[PDB]
Amino acid sequence: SAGIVPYQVKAQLYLFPGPEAELIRAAAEASLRDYISAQRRLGRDIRRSALFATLHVEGVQRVELQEPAADVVLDETQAAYCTGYAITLGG
Amino acid sequence: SAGIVPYQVKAQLYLFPGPEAELIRAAAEASLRDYISAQRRLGRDIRRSALFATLHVEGVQRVELQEPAADVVLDETQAAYCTGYAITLGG
């Protein structure tokens, strides 16, 4: 099999309309980048449920998560690598 | 007129191998009860993404959320009511 498993995170955040909206999105992105780094360091699977939790910073009413469409499960010889992310407002 | 829209929360928690499973489960349930009361008081929609975030307390690796199977979206005259919950351990 391939040794590196690629994944992307594509999500839309739905917020209440207000001036903090762009900031909340940046907070969600920072939280995500922290998650990406942590999972890389700990070599863990990428779970949709954890990504929802990661993106649900304060002010986020719902998260629509397009990618990854399914969990990223690694076999014993694989490592996961995030090939990019796109966190936008729904909203 | 508009009534009350019922929902239940059925989920299984998959935890990281380590401490006592039951304390983590109680914390997730406690977090859930807070979410239920908060949404009822604010009359907001019930979103699966928010429930994932709610159940992802420390120690939780993955959340399987059976119910509610879909988001509970209310019109301007409706209210949501949780008719019960079941938070169990996966493995």
In chain A, what are the domain boundaries? 1-91
CA distance B21 to B23: 6
Residue B25 tokens, joined: 């489960």
Residues of B whose CB is below 8 A from A63: 49-50, 53
Looking at residue B73, its amino acid is: V
Looking at residue A87, its amino acid is: I
CA distance A28 to B53: 13
CA distance B70 to B64: 13
Q: After which residues is chain A broken (C to N over 2.5 A)?
A: none
Residue corresponding to tokens 């959320």:
B65
Angle in degrees, CA B17, B20, B24, rounded to 5:
90
CA distance A20 to B40: 25
H or E element: which one contains A22?
helix A21-42
CA distance B26 to A5: 35
CA distance B43 to A68: 31
Closest residue of A to B65, CA-based? A49
Name the structure determination technique.
Answer: X-ray
**In whole angstroms, what separates CA A35 from the centre of its chain?**
7
CA distance B41 to B70: 21
Residue A7 tokens, joined: 């994944």
Q: In what order do the strands lie in the sheet containing A4-15?
A: A60-67, A4-15, A79-89
How many interchain CB pairs under 8 A, A with B? 47
Resolution (A): 2.1
Do A62 and B49 form a contact (C-beta atoms < 8 A)? yes
Residues of B with CB under 8 A from a CB of A: 44-45, 47-50, 52-53, 55-56, 61-65, 71
Contact A47 B62 (CB under 8 A): yes
CA distance A61 to A84: 24
Q: What is the dihedral of CA B52, A10, A29, B68, to 10 degrees?
A: -10
- E strands, chain A, where? 4-15, 60-67, 79-89
As a whole number of Å, the CA-based R_g of chain A is 14
Instruction: Give the one of B44, B45, B52 whose C-beta lies nearest to A52's C-beta.
Output: B52
Q: Are strands B4-15 and B60-67 parallel, antiparallel or unpaired?
A: antiparallel
